[PDB]
Scaffold this active site. Structure first.
Site, short mmCIF file in Angstrom:
data_model
loop_
_atom_site.label_atom_id
_atom_site.label_comp_id
_atom_site.label_asym_id
_atom_site.label_seq_id
_atom_site.Cartn_x
_atom_site.Cartn_y
_atom_site.Cartn_z
CD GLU A 12 12.71 2.51 6.82
OE1 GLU A 12 13.37 3.35 6.18
OE2 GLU A 12 12.68 2.47 8.07
CB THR A 17 3.57 -4.05 6.38
OG1 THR A 17 4.74 -3.59 7.06
CG2 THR A 17 2.38 -3.96 7.32
NE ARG A 147 13.36 -0.46 8.70
CZ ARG A 147 14.64 -0.16 8.46
NH1 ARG A 147 15.57 -0.52 9.34
NH2 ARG A 147 14.98 0.49 7.36
CG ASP A 169 8.72 -8.32 0.35
OD1 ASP A 169 9.01 -7.28 -0.28
OD2 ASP A 169 8.72 -8.39 1.60
CD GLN A 173 19.22 -2.14 2.31
OE1 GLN A 173 20.19 -1.43 2.60
NE2 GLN A 173 18.85 -3.18 3.05
N1 LIG Z 1 1.64 3.65 10.47
C1 LIG Z 1 1.92 2.87 9.40
N2 LIG Z 1 3.05 2.12 9.43
C2 LIG Z 1 3.37 1.32 8.39
C3 LIG Z 1 2.48 1.25 7.22
N3 LIG Z 1 3.04 0.38 6.35
C4 LIG Z 1 4.19 -0.07 6.91
N4 LIG Z 1 4.37 0.48 8.14
C5 LIG Z 1 5.52 0.26 9.04
O1 LIG Z 1 6.67 0.83 8.41
C6 LIG Z 1 7.82 0.01 8.64
C7 LIG Z 1 8.41 -0.42 7.30
O2 LIG Z 1 7.50 -1.30 6.64
P1 LIG Z 1 8.06 -2.49 5.72
O3 LIG Z 1 6.92 -3.45 5.46
O4 LIG Z 1 9.20 -3.19 6.42
O5 LIG Z 1 8.58 -1.79 4.38
P2 LIG Z 1 9.48 -2.52 3.27
O6 LIG Z 1 9.00 -2.01 1.93
O7 LIG Z 1 9.28 -4.01 3.38
O8 LIG Z 1 11.02 -2.11 3.50
P3 LIG Z 1 12.28 -2.90 2.86
O9 LIG Z 1 12.14 -4.48 3.17
O10 LIG Z 1 12.34 -2.66 1.27
S1 LIG Z 1 13.89 -2.20 3.72
C8 LIG Z 1 7.34 -1.18 9.45
O11 LIG Z 1 7.62 -0.93 10.83
C9 LIG Z 1 5.84 -1.21 9.24
O12 LIG Z 1 5.14 -1.72 10.38
C10 LIG Z 1 1.27 2.10 7.26
O13 LIG Z 1 0.46 2.11 6.31
N5 LIG Z 1 1.07 2.86 8.35
MG LIG Z 2 10.48 -5.74 3.24
#
Ligand SMILES: Nc1nc2c(ncn2[C@@H]2O[C@H](COP(=O)(O)OP(=O)(O)OP(O)(O)=S)[C@@H](O)[C@H]2O)c(=O)[nH]1
Ligand SMILES: [Mg+2]
Length: 315
Positions: A12, A17, A147, A169, A173
């Site tokens: 997360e 994103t 998400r 990517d 987790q």
């Molecule tokens: N407000 C806000 N929300 C964000 C930002 N970056 C990501 N998010 C939100 O947080 C949530 C998690 O982002 P995500 O892109 O899925 O992380 P991840 O690193 O890919 O997570 P994973 O695949 O290792 S489980 C998503 O709902 C995304 O829209 C940000 O800079 N600001």
């Molecule tokens: Mg991801």
């Protein structure tokens, strides 16, 4: 020339994103058919978020503000199945909207660091009237806010400044961290994502482990791995928008007990930057390129990735 970028960071932190933003900025965005695929994800995210809050009122013993919401919460679980299939009846939206405006639900929402709640919970719930419409088609921002936990390796390609990017990517987790090694070959640059607003949160896989401390451990391992000596290390201190709001009311000493600065964005942000950059054991021979980002903000990501590309170009 071909450029291989690897997105790393805890779960997360914003990695997927960033992937979405590359399609928006560098390949004309998501088409209508693609946006419609995310409609079920938006609905699933929304229903899961209000259910998580309702669940938490039970564990934290928080009453509804109005006793009539007890019937709405009953109907919530009765009707929830439709949303988990990409449909949103007018009756379900009314149930969610009333629950979301209840003062007891809002009290629990403002204690979300005591449980697990999607960062986009308020984004979707405050926009229920728009997303509940018939023939609703998610916007680009709606797609960016979705998400879904990443499992496996996601590979996307795009062209920018005459460069052919291959962006990788992986899931962040703990169950997916063992898979990171499969992407370690031929990496031009690493973009390590950190959720700045994780400083007062704990891991979903472990309520005793601070999220930001886990991020620091992962960055320590990656940045100092001899295999990446010649790989550019880019650090995205992400979710700066959520951090700016949280720093006003949640003390940073939750994460760093020795922090003596004010509860303002600039001082606290710089303090976290230094905490991560200080893990670099080779400060004289290895450079870290740090940027503060809001991964859901297309304009911010565009200018940040523009600056990143120049560093990669210049090597
Ligand atoms: N407000 C806000 N929300 C964000 C930002 N970056 C990501 N998010 C939100 O947080 C949530 C998690 O982002 P995500 O892109 O899925 O992380 P991840 O690193 O890919 O997570 P994973 O695949 O290792 S489980 C998503 O709902 C995304 O829209 C940000 O800079 N600001
Ligand atoms: Mg991801």
């Amino acid at each position: 020339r071909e450029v291989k970028l690897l997105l790393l960071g805890a779960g997360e932190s914003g990695k997927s994103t960033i992937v979405k933003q590359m399609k928006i900025i560098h390949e004309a965005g998501y088409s209508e058919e693609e946006c419609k695929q995310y409609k079920a994800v938006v609905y699933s995210n929304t229903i899961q978020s209000i259910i998580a809050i309702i669940r938490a009122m039970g564990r934290l013993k928080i009453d509804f503000g109005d006793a009539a919401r007890a019937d709405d919460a009953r109907q919530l679980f009765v009707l929830a199945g439709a949303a988990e299939e990409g449909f949103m009846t007018a009756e379900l939206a009314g149930v969610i909207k009333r629950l979301w405006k209840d003062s007891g639900v809002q009290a629990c929402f403002n204690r979300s660091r005591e449980y697990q709640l999607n960062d986009s919970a308020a984004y979707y719930l405050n926009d229920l009237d728009r997303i509940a419409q018939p023939n609703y088609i998610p916007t680009q921002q709606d797609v960016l806010r979705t998400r879904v936990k990443t499992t496996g390796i996601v590979e996307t390609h795009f062209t920018f400044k005459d460069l052919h990017f291959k962006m990788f990517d992986v899931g962040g987790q703990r169950s997916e961290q063992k898979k990171w090694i499969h992407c370690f070959e031929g990496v031009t640059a690493i973009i390590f994502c950190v959720a700045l607003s994780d400083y007062d949160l704990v891991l979903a896989e472990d309520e005793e482990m601070n999220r930001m401390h886990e991020s620091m451990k992962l960055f320590d391992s990656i940045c100092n791995n001899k295999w990446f000596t010649d790989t550019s290390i880019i650090l995205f201190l992400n979710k700066k928008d959520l951090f700016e709001e949280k720093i006003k009311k949640s003390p940073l000493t939750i994460c760093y007990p020795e922090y003596a600065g004010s509860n303002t964005y600039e001082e606290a942000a710089a303090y976290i930057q230094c905490q991560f950059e200080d893990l670099n054991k080779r400060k004289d021979t290895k450079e870290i390129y740090t940027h503060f980002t809001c991964a859901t903000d297309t304009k911010n990501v565009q200018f940040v990735f523009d600056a990143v590309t120049d560093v990669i170009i210049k090597n």
